[PDB]
Amino acid sequence: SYYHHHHHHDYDIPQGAMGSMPPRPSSGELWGIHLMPPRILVECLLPNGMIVTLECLREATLITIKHELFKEARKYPLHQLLQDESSYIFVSVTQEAEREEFFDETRRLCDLRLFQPFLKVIEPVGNREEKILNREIGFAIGMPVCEFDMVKDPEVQDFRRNILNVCKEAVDLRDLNSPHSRAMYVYPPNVESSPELPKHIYNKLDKGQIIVVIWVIVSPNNDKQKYTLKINHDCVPEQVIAEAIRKKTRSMLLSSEQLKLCVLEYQGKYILKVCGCDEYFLEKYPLSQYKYIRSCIMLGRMPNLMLMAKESLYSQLPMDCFTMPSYSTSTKSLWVINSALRIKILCATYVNVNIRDIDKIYVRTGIYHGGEPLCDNVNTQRVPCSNPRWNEWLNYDIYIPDLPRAARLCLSICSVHCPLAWGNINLFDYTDTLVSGKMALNLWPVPHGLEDLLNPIGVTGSNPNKETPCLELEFDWFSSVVKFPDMSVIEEHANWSVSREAGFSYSHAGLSNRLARDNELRENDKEQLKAISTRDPLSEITEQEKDFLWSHRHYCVTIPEILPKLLLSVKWNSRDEVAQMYCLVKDWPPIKPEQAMELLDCNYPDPMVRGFAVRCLEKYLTDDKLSQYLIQLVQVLKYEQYLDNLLVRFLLKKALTNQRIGHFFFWHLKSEMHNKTVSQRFGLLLESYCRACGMYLKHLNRQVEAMEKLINLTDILKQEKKDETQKVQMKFLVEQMRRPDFMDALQGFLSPLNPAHQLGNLRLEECRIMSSAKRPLWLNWENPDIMSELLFQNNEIIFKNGDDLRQDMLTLQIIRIMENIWQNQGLDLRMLPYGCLSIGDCVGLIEVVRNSHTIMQIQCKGGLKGALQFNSHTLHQWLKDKNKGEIYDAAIDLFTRSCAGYCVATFILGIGDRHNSNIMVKDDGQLFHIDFGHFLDHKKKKRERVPFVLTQDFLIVISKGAQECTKTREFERFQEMCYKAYLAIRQHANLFINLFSMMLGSGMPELQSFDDIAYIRKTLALDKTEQEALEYFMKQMNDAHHGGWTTK
Amino acid sequence: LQDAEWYSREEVNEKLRDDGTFLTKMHGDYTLTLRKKLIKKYSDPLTSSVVELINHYRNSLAQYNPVYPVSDNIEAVGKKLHEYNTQFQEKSREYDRLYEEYTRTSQEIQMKRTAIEAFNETIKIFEEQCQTQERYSKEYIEKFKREGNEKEIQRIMHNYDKLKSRISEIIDSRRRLEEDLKKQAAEYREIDKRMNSIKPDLIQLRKTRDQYLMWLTQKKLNEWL
């Protein structure tokens, strides 16, 4: 009766059930097995040809193993044919299939990444032992350096040798005014962008003063002493250092004049540390302008600095010691070539198709510039579905001189209408040489979101994976290597192309592409241009507007900010036009970085444009702002045509100029090394960084090693220890963490979430596996700072093996940026964008916020006894329970200030639906969201959603217990914060579009193409006027809530 | 003029999605969105209506500036939306599962390939080692003459026996990888194969489900979807 007695015969019961943890799988300490057995046999191949098999412990060092090998080899034959043991080094085949010599004989048998458990004994060949520490480099990069040396392609080799230009120049800046400048590389001052202070920070100062606390140390360094100055906010470290020495050294045995002299011989020997972490105040900024201070002000905290002698600081700094590695008029112009383009398709080989399902298959083709320079074509649907071979010159309606520098062929095999594979080639190579001859393009399979035929925003180049559709082809050969024009030549052609237009005559209908208004344009025009200039990148421009722009291009220099719209309004298929655009760009007024970043997205692939864009960054983009946007800048390298380019040279330099940038620049590259779209590019780039970065390589190698311990550890917990009790697993976890290899590897190192914090010594009692099915590890470290207690005695961060962090990571960044927007425009909403860092393929790190609880814990703890119900006041009650006195009043301000911001950010982004277990509240009353999920509304493919719907719980707390909260001023306030915030983001909406646009590079399913990003238009309502948009938001917010939100 | 069959930017992209097809007040009036192109009496040649301007150019846009007018139960055509939407979402999981298996099998394979390079490298070093001992072992048979003759050479030959038979095990271990490499590489061709047959029928299912939702809208929808 239930199922109308309908059977499902197919259905049998004998990764949905316990459906969590879907990445996998990475082999560990040996081949085929995650974690070598605690005792193990190893076949030792000797110089005398004898095999002796030692039983060693997993954890044994090579020094220990050698010492025993040569003891136990006396007992075997041919002993007299062995030299003293010291005359030998170890070697084996590793899991990357290379023969690594083992020089650092402290290393343990598990940590070697062997393939088969066997060591060969030998004398150290290649007497520069020193040089064969690019194992160091290869370890950091996670692919051996010799793997580049056997690459044929000259671009790669050329990148490798030429990029050293950058490495040498950056290292010359470091040892300029050393040791200070070295300390400045290593410990670069962590400083806000502006010295100017927001009003709400200022008002915490009583006419610009903060109580500070300078600590100092005395014999035998154990006893420390406070010195609480009350100084100006905008005074500098040296002024503060003086006052702390004044106070330390006033005395009843020193006159004032005697003091003044004792200040001068002391004042410049010291510098200001932060108690609890390795931050320093090495240069003249307003104390306020340092990040640490400003946080201390906002949190109502007293800064706790330390006087540190410079010699104890230049003690610790090493020598960075850079070395050069072992790897150290003509034939034709394109504009001569008087044919159109034709490209020959030959034979796709490895195509996997059901002859039953599919009728017919063909090769669609096109030429592109991000958007395309001719009507797209195919070829005829020949030898379909079964060994397909076309032998057709395809004919593209475009002259060969009208191909732009960055022109690209995009192609794809399809089904009848449905793409099988794809791949795109650059029509010019890195040396400017037109592509002629026979090419072997291996193809890429179509992604999730992409249904379209051809995919041109896809990566330029072949797949490296051999066993894929290998569609070979032939390019027209013109009896000479055809090259792209010089710039000197494109200049001349423009100078002629302009002078020629000045004599074209009276009537030109299709006025479109030329002024006719001359030096005197109309004023209705001049305001319709700045009207275009305001529009975001996704408000698509019409042919009329395009042509209108293109004619007035010379007045467009007045409005530099128009440039993206202008550049998109060029006919890139008309070199006459293109040659003129190059001449404007040549000296176009530099613009703001947040606007110039648009120009490094996929829609602006020209080298001259991207040049001008980097030029802007070189001028305006501070080391601060670079850090903020580094994620997008790494991602945008993908869209560069060639390995060696201006953007790579810019970042690489900054990276080797500032070690805090360096750090994240390593990790963001290192993250994506799994991805074959970038393994080459990033591998090479990372080799450069790693060869030039000084002692930070050794620090990275420690971080790296620690992560790969945790990768193996969680990897076992998720395969062989699934279907065990937490009890059993947790026993296994703590057993393993106590082995000395784990103790070595997981104790003395820097937090990759923030390398200022040091991790020392695991407290294994506070280390535990969380409940989640992904088996994330809660890890806890002792802060080994001299003033640990002043900041945090314990540092704890979560490591997650199963889950892709980079959605979160971007939303978190996107929040951090809304926060700064809001605050630097005087209005306080306190977002808590916690730390997140992806370090690999669905592997990552999340900052723990101590003293916070999922609303669901508040309710589970607020246990109305007996399972009757949870009370909506329980949050309010729980919050009261914490904050009592005038404190309570301020905690509701905080809750109300955070709750507003998070409501707007959430709404605009359209992050996952919010609920009890993914909202969090802190003892002091701040609220913040976690586990964001799919950002730009990714389940709508299956609405303008409101994810944060403020239930009673929250509303009660916004007003202070009042009933019918809808109608308090407590709430009126809250609403006006929401409206002021909503609009704040709407004046910066270009930036957010742009940040999202730059992130299409990454293979994020939620960012496949621009209409994914287009959601953020609706939700901001950029087509509307702000007062309509206001009312749209109020409208959207009102329907989700069922009352409130009208009569502004 | 209002109905006109063909008559904001976001949804028009999703209606032009997948060469010739076509369809703020203060900026301008109406927009012609031709796919190959947004194009603004109703430029220079102005001569009466919006229906007037489209019927002329349906018969090319080259001479204007230097190339498909694509556009009764209610409750039961609304169940169909739930039906095709359960089919379409059923189909997505199948396409999503297999894109993971494909990529895992791309890795599992390429992991195997490396391991074979590794084995082969290992074996070289073992083959180089039996070579290594024949040099010195056979210098250390003749050099001795009679001393320890078999009490030495047995235990030299024993070692040598273990060496090459350990080689024997490796080579067989490699072969056994290579067999499974092809089995994996077969399954890999099978994953692609079925992805290519699901894909065309995924898009059609999607397309009908849109037109079924188009025809209705000519808040209630969310329970079906």
Ligand SMILES: N#Cc1cccc(N)c1
């Ligand atoms: N117009 C237009 C258009 C259509 C698709 C993509 C982009 N970038 C532009």
